[PDB]
Design a protein around this ligand. Structure first.
Ligand SMILES: Nc1nc2c(ncn2[C@@H]2O[C@H](COP(=O)(O)OP(=O)(O)O)[C@@H](O)[C@H]2O)c(=O)[nH]1
Ligand SMILES: [Mg+2]
Lengths: 339, 148, 50, 46
């Protein structure tokens, strides 16, 4: 079923008004090859993002979702073009990246602005940022790390923005850069949500139970584990349905995660984000209620005649005639006498 | 109570007395060109006497200028109300976020209070509108006008 | 005193007082707006109730 | 005792303040009725 906040978004679209909900920007921050860019793909539900090992996310991508009855994508740099096959959206993103950065593993702080229309999406702003690195390669300047942090700080240091800290499972959690940044900009943990993206590649003999139970590095909002599609599966174009079924089987089977099975995986992350957004618009609703009630008060006095409108109604015609004749006589007398 | 901040600030909801002594500034920030007032008065008179020859100045030439001047003050009153709400929110944050180490509690105790404040914003604006609307409904020349 | 008496004498009193197309379109848009607006307030209600 | 001088002072201020209150009441009662009882009636009639 559709969550109630989406019911409000549908109603607001359905009334053709510019009243809307004020929702936070969602930033996803990870690290090189951590997989942050692959999480948004499953969150949105359409496989359009560039993906793969190496430097694949070179420019910050600003993805805005809009509720509409037609499903499509638009770019600001491709004016008037209605994209319907996202597998060309991928190509336009790669082409626009190369056009500015160059092919030698470059980056650029200038964002790519993508807008996606679909029937049951809120007006969220999603930011896919380039991952952090330590060693420059490919003619990147020695200060590539500082430029990357400078790009990150302009999105993660803003208020009214959520930070999703993406960390791999196969690399010791103490080394995670996303947790360092979230800790630096959210000391209290009110905004940071942690995700462990690679439980499939754990070294045999170990597990991550001490992280998913929020014991090793306690974080106010806990950690969510997921399993994403491997490089082979994306090269085989495995359907998203099969990936989700495999993830559910993974969590149900693995002996060390059964008791957490109902708190893990992409759809749980979706429920958690929906709850955080729903709890973010509380204490804003009174204004929307007052505006909607005011408009209803200014329409209801008139629509009573329309609700019972009939093509054949001599009483309505007679009374309208009498009122208009009265108004004409009074308006003429006022206009010429000056009273 | 005791423990007042005698040195550091002028603060702690004593800012609201500035709004009550700052709103008298917004009410005089507004200005008009006298030539437009004279033109409008001349047309008010010419439009009150429709065809008749005028012996005495009509009383609607006063009332219809006063109503037009009075309609202008709806905006600054709403600005004042919004500023007062802002100060209440700031005070709640100071009394909530800075003194409590428990998570989640400082969220419930701020959210609830600021929700109640917004609802009272609604009721207050309605009462302000029903006061200005009353200023328009009748012209009272009895108390302190320029008595002939 | 006379205008209405004359209006009753014009035409056939069947095509007089017939709505234009624009009023019909406005009627339809107003009814759509009314129903969607009530729905929005119902959903806000349900959200505050939880 | 000096206390009486304080009491007299308070009385004078009260009378002064009450005069202002009286003006407001006299001013707002007519205007209120014209808005709610007489003008709503004219608008009803017309
Ligand atoms: N097996 C497996 N591989 C993953 C998982 N998540 C991410 N990967 C791989 O890691 C690669 C790098 O992540 P990517 O999506 O490019 O985003 P990046 O963090 O910006 O590189 C992905 O393309 C996947 O091939 C996972 O859960 N399981
Ligand atoms: Mg990336």
């Amino acid at each position: 079923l559709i969550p109630l906040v989406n019911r409000l978004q549908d109603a607001f679209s359905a009334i053709g008004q510019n009243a809307d909900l004020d929702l936070p920007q969602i930033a996803v921050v990870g690290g090189q090859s951590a997989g942050a860019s692959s999480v948004l793909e499953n969150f949105v539900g359409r496989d359009f993002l560039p993906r793969g090992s190496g430097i694949v996310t070179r420019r910050p991508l600003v993805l805005q979702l809009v509720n509409a009855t037609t499903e499509y994508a638009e770019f600001l740099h491709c004016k008037g073009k209605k994209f319907t096959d996202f597998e060309e959206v991928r190509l336009e993103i790669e082409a626009e990246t190369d056009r500015v950065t160059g092919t030698n593993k470059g980056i650029s702080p200038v964002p790519i602005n993508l807008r996606v229309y679909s029937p049951h999406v809120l007006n969220l702003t999603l930011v896919d940022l380039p991952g952090m690195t330590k060693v420059p390669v490919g003619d990147q300047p020695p200060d590539i790390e500082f430029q990357i942090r400078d790009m990150l700080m302009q999105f993660v240091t803003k208020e009214n923005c959520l930070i999703l800290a993406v960390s791999p499972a196969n690399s010791d959690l103490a080394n995670s850069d996303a947790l360092k940044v979230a800790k630096e900009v959210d000391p209290q943990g009110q905004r940071t949500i942690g995700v462990i993206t690679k439980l499939d590649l754990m070294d045999e003999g170990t597990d991550a139970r001490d992280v998913l139970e929020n014991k090793l590095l306690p974080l106010r909002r806990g950690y969510i584990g997921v399993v994403n599609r491997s490089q082979k599966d994306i090269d085989g174009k495995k359907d998203i349905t099969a990936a989700l079924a495999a993830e559910r089987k993974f969590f149900l089977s693995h002996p060390s995660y059964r008791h957490l099975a109902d708190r893990m995986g992409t759809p749980y992350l979706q429920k958690v984000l929906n709850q955080q957004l729903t709890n973010h618009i509380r204490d804003t609703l009174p204004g929307l209620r007052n505006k909607l009630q005011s408009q209803l008060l200014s329409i209801e006095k008139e629509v009573e005649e329309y609700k019972n409108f009939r093509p054949d109604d001599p009483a309505r015609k007679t009374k309208a005639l009498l009122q208009m004749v009265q108004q004409f006589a009074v308006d003429f007398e006022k206009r010429i006498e000056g009273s | 109570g005791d423990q007042i901040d005698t040195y550091e600030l002028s603060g702690g909801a004593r800012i609201n007395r500035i709004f009550h002594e700052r709103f008298p500034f917004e009410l005089v920030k507004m200005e008009f060109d006298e030539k437009e007032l004279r033109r409008e008065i001349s047309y008010a008179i010419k439009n009150i006497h429709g065809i008749r020859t005028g012996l005495f100045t009509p009383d609607m030439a006063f009332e219809t200028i006063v109503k037009k001047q009075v309609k202008k003050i709806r905006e600054p009153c709403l600005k004042c109300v919004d500023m007062v709400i802002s100060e209440l929110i700031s005070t709640v944050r100071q009394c909530t976020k800075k003194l409590q180490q428990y998570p989640r509690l400082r969220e419930e105790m701020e959210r609830i209070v600021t929700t109640h404040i917004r609802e009272r914003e609604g009721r207050t604006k309605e009462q302000v509108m029903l006061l200005i609307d009353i200023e328009l409904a009748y012209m009272n020349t009895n108390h302190e006008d320029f008595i002939g | 005193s006379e205008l209405l008496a004359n209006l009753y004498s014009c035409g056939d009193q069947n095509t007089l007082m017939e709505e234009s197309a624009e009023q019909a379109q406005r009627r339809d848009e107003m009814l759509r707006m009314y129903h969607a607006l009530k729905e929005a307030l119902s959903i806000i209600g349900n959200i505050n109730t939880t | 005792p000096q206390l009486e001088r304080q009491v007299e002072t308070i009385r004078n201020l009260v009378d002064s303040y009450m005069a202002i209150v009286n003006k407001t009441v006299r001013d707002l009662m007519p205007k209120t009725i014209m808005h709610l009882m007489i003008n709503n009636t004219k608008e009803f009639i017309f």
